[PDB]
Amino acid sequence: ANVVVRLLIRRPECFGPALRGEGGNGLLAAMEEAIKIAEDPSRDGPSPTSGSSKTMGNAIMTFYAALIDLLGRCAPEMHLIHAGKGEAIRIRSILRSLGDLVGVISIAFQMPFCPDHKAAMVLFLDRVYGIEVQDFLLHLLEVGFLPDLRAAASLDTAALSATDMALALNRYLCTAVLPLLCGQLRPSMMQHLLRRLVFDVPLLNEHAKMPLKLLTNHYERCWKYYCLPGGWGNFGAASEEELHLSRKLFWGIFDALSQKKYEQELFKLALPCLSAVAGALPPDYMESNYVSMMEKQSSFNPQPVDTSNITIPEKLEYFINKYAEHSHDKWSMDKLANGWIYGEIYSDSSKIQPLMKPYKLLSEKEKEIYRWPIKESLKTMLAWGWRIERTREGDSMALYNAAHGYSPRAIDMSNVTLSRDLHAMAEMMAENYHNIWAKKKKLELESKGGGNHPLLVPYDTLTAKEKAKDREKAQDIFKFLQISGYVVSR
Amino acid sequence: EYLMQTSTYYYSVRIFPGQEPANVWVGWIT
Amino acid sequence: ESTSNSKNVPPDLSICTFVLEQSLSVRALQEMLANMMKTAQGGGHRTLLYGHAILLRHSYSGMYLCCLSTSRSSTDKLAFDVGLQEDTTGEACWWTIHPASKQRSEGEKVRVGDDLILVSVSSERYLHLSYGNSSWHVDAAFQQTLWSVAPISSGSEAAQGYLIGGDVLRLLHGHMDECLTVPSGEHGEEQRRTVHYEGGAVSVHARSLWRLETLRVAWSGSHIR
Amino acid sequence: PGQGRNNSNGLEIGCVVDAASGLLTFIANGKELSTYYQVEPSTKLFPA
């Protein structure tokens, strides 16, 4: 390795196609120029578009993948014999200098392309850089975001849906054990891993995924598992007699020695402990499914409901109109930031909006647009059935500090804390909204007759990018449901 | 004798009062 | 410094003068700190051999030119730019020489005025002459670039107070102790161009000093004939 | 009752009067209502 590194860096004629300067091997330009030529079009640059699962085409981005694979495999051995004390530090310094090469994470981020090249990409980081520090793992937090999302969708015994590249994906995830050897915001990769064992497509490959879920909780905080334990307990109670024998292993690993200095609650552990007790006796005998189960205590929904024949009582007469006007005021503030002004004749070029007027004079189209989601939401939890309060002192509709007297003002209502029961109700409403989105996705998929989308997935599947929008919508729900003296609870 | 003037030492210990968390009391103390 | 235009644009050799301090072998990798002179003080005036590590000391500054780890050079994104540093500590401190071709070999004695190849012992890079924008830029790169040495002065000369070129001096009168002096103007505009004499306090001071140097690049710091 | 939009409720701007025998002005409201507290001159120090 030392000799080949010395000779290759003495004679770097492996030039790059786009970037200038002596040498080359600039992935940040070569990979990006090669994908636009290879993915949609054919092997040549000027060429028509054809080819599905096609694994100047397959040449350059495999030649590179081989090059960084060779560099990673010839990187000096780490943390077994040599740890910065064997004169081999100059080789690692040269490899890091070839920062530009630190952008291997950025290179792997461009997920649309053979899945096997990502194995070399992560192997380079394992060899020359290492993720032993928590900062890089906090930066990434996933082996691959879109690959993890896509492996969830590609799980079925179908011809055109899976069993085409999912095997290569499974091999790449088998390689992907970098997190092995204190979650800050929300690491939820074990929920993604839960889908893998539901239907074991690759035989014997679940052994590589067992420690990814096992050792994760040891590093993870007990409280960081919030409602994913509830979902997993639901699935475990459903499949208490199943080939998924890692459920009891996770049960033991959590319940035993999950009691830290905090000594967290066991009331939520009582809900599935009785289910496990009542489901362990009707089965007659398994040889190892009940051995370690000695101490279990310290001491997908596409259609939520149907509201075709639900009548809304007319207890909403004033606050609904007030909050519709508040939403219109927020829209007016947004269009004022855009540059729109009130006028008489609508004109897109001149940025004239004649709708800058009170809700009583507003148009029926925008009135229905503002009223339909709120009315549908109210109908939904009225259909579910919960109590409604009318507290007198909760009247915070108008308490914070142009033509027709239209003077909207910004209100900072995001500083208010809400209760856990109201949070659960808003989470149910958010699940209903996600199911509505899933319904529109199913309708458009049926209309198109073919396609796939990785957003037909539960809460924990969502990464931070979409979770930001989800939290913004949840905050809007909190703002709507925290005022007007109306309280909903069980 | 601040002739041709209203007051002096125009300054403020600024606290944003528009949020009104609990309708805070503001004034000098001894 | 462009010394080719010797008749048109005169060069300066005080900043270009370089002195070799020590010559060790690459095999003789002495132990690091927490076991600077322990054993490398035997004899003196040791001859120089091919393949031995050498240390470049600048003439009027005690800084050493070796292996600057900076990425300020964006010409090719890879070649390091070499600078100057003080401490003779760390592996990125020494350069070793190599022959130009097979006509020499590693182990011989370097003759005067040969052709030399220099490599950083740390990054294994050579001195480079990349062109930024119609200009020269010293870089630590892996490309070939030949170099030559010209002996300016020797350390074995028994001068003990004789005249050697490159040394600043005073032209003074023996009897009246009078030396030349240039006046100072309002702010360096025109009044620095006049010449006059001045004795007494201004004798042993700054403004009455000039540098004497020979036009010849090779052996400029020689006895003046 | 003006209810200034956003954080535009005066920010307690201070204006010392020429005489400390009668009163000193330190208000945040847009209009004066009542800050009399007639006391003899006591102290003026760091803002608190």
3-state SS of chain A is CHHHHHHHHHCCCCCCCCCCCCCCCCHHHHHHHHHHHHCCECCCCCCCECCCCCCCCCCHHHHHHHHHHHHHHHCCCCCCCCCCCCCCHHHHHHHHHCCCHHHHHHHHHCCCCCCHHHHHHHHHHHHHHCCCCHHHHHHHCCCCHHHHHHHHHCCCCCCCCCCCCHHHHHHHHHHCCCCCCCCCCCCCHHHHHHHHHHCCCCCCCHHHHHHHHHHHHHHCCCCCCCCHHHHHHHHHHHCCCCCCCHHHHHHHHHHCCCCCCCCCCCHHHHHHHHHHHHHHCCCCCCCCCCCCCCCCCCCCCCCCCCCCCCCCCCCCCCHHHHHHHHHHHHHHHHHHHHCCECCCCCECCCCECCCCCCCCCCCHHHHHHHHHHHHHHHHHHHHHCCEEEECCCCCCCCCCCCHHHCCCCCCCCCCCCCCHHHHHHHHHHHHHHHHHHHHHHHHHHHHHCCCCCCCCCCCCCCCHHHHHHHHHHHHHHHHHHCCCCEEEEC
Task: Return all residues near A28 (Cβ < 8 A) that are at least 6 apart.
Answer: A100, A103, A106, A107
Q: Which of A126, A116, A222, A114 is nearest to A174 (CA)?
A: A116
The residue of chain B nearest to residue D12, with distances taken between CA atoms, is: B12
Residue linked to tokens 């900076």: C70
The answer to whether A128 and A99 are in contact (CB under 8 A) is no
**In chain A, which residues have their Cβ closer than 8 Å to the Cβ of D6?**
401, 409-410, 412
A245 touches chain C (CB under 8 A): no
Q: Which of C199, C133, C140 is nearest to C171 (CA)?
A: C199
Measured N-to-C along each axis, helices A206-219 and A246-255 cross at an angle, to the nearest 10 degrees, of: 10
Alpha carbons D15 and B7: distance in angstroms, whole number: 6
Joined tokens for residue A304: 């939520």
Amino acid at A446: E
- Reported as type and span, the H/E element at residue C66 is none
The answer to whether C86 and C64 are in contact (CB under 8 A) is yes
Per-window interface: B 1-30 vs D, CB < 8 A:
1-2, 6-19, 26-30
Would the CB atoms of D3 and A401 count as touching at under 8 Å? yes
- Name the DSSP class of C225: -
> Looking at CA atoms only, how far is residue A326 from chain B in angstroms?
18
Joined tokens for residue A394: 């909760």
Would the CB atoms of A401 and B21 count as touching at under 8 Å? no
Would the CB atoms of D12 and B14 count as touching at under 8 Å? yes
> How far from A12 is each of A4, C70, C79, CA to CA, in Å?
12, 21, 12
The residue of chain A nearest to residue B16, with distances taken between CA atoms, is: A401
Would the CB atoms of C123 and A9 count as touching at under 8 Å? no
Chains C and B touch (3+ CB pairs under 8 A): no
Task: Return all residues near A94 (Cβ < 8 A) that are at least 6 apart.
Answer: A5, A9, C123, C124
Amino acid at D48: A
* Experimental determination approach used: cryo-EM
Would the CB atoms of B18 and D7 count as touching at under 8 Å? yes
> Looking at CA atoms only, how far is residue B9 from chain D in angstroms?
6
Give CA C130 to chain center in angstroms.
21
Alpha carbons A206 and A200: distance in angstroms, whole number: 7
| Residue A331 backbone dihedrals phi, psi, to 5 degrees | -65, -40
In a 10 Å sphere around its CB, with 0-12 CB exposed, 13-18 middle and 19+ buried, how is residue A405 labelled? exposed
Which of B28, B29, B30 to substitute to test the interface with D, most D CBs within 10 Å? B28
- Name the DSSP class of C51: T
Of D3, D5, D9, the CB nearest to A410: D5
| Residue C81 backbone dihedrals phi, psi, to 5 degrees | -105, 130
The neighbour count for residue A196, using CB atoms within 10 Å, is 20
Computed from CA positions of residues A157, A160, A164, A170, in that sequence, does the dihedral angle turn out positive or negative? Answer: negative
Would the CB atoms of D3 and A410 count as touching at under 8 Å? no
| Residues found in chain D | 48
Joined tokens for residue C91: 């592996």
